[model samples]
Target: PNLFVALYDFESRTENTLSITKGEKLRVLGYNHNGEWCEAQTKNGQGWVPSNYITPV
Candidate 1:
């Protein structure tokens, strides 16, 4: 897939937290089909965030 864009601010609610801001770009590392989160890499680091907060770019 292409880069993902954060649609809103997200705070890490777990160990794999992706602290991203709205409109920020992310490199998707993986996806969580069983949950609402997905693995991705930001300018900061790698973590998981709500899939609903991101969109294909």
Candidate 2:
């Protein structure tokens, strides 16, 4: 498993979107079928995040 940190504030585009703020730490659980989106789990709970918004920690 890889840990990720948010680079900028992000707003959810969908119901499953995770609200991430700069410096928030998350764990990558998996990715979408095409791998453009990531399924991440954080203390706030699991949600889908744009892969572009996060960097591996």
Candidate 3:
């Protein structure tokens, strides 16, 4: 599993998205071919998050 840390706070805009706070850790499941979004899992839940919101750990 690919792990990443949130660089900034992100709030999901839809039901298929996940919200994350700055400094939170997340496991990256997959990346969009276009590199705009990623499917990530945190302790709270799992969903799509903006790729730019996190950095690889």
Candidate 4:
């Protein structure tokens, strides 16, 4: 699977608690299913994160 990161803010506007540095690979846990958005597995836990940050490896 193509790995990605959270460049900006995806969780919310008020807080940027979630941050994915370069080369971070969050395993695909779940998603919107339609490919609209995806849920990824982070070190902390799982959350709704967009797939825009992902690119083919």
- Descending-lDDT candidate ranking: 3, 2, 1, 4
- Cα RMSD to native, each candidate? 1.3, 1.3, 1.2, 4.1
The 10-residue segment of model 2 with minimum total lDDT is 8-17
lDDT per residue for candidate 4 within 1-57, as digits (tens), equals: 635555544543323224444556676645576775666666756555666754434
Candidate 3 off by > 4 Å: none
Clashing pairs in 2: none
Clashing pairs in 4: none
Candidate 4 wrongly placed segments (more than 4 Å): 2-19
All models: lDDT?
0.88, 0.89, 0.94, 0.55
What would the per-residue lDDT of candidate 1 be over residues 1-57, giving only the tens digit for each residue? Answer: 769999999988778687999999998877787868888898899999888899999
Better of 3 and 4 by TM-score: 3
Q: How many backbone clashes does candidate 2 have?
A: 0
Per-prediction TM-score to the true structure, in the order listed: 0.86, 0.86, 0.92, 0.51
**What digit string (tens of lDDT, one per residue) describes model 3 on residues 1-57?**
498999999998899999999999999999989999999999989999999999999
| Model 4 TM-score relative to the real fold | 0.51
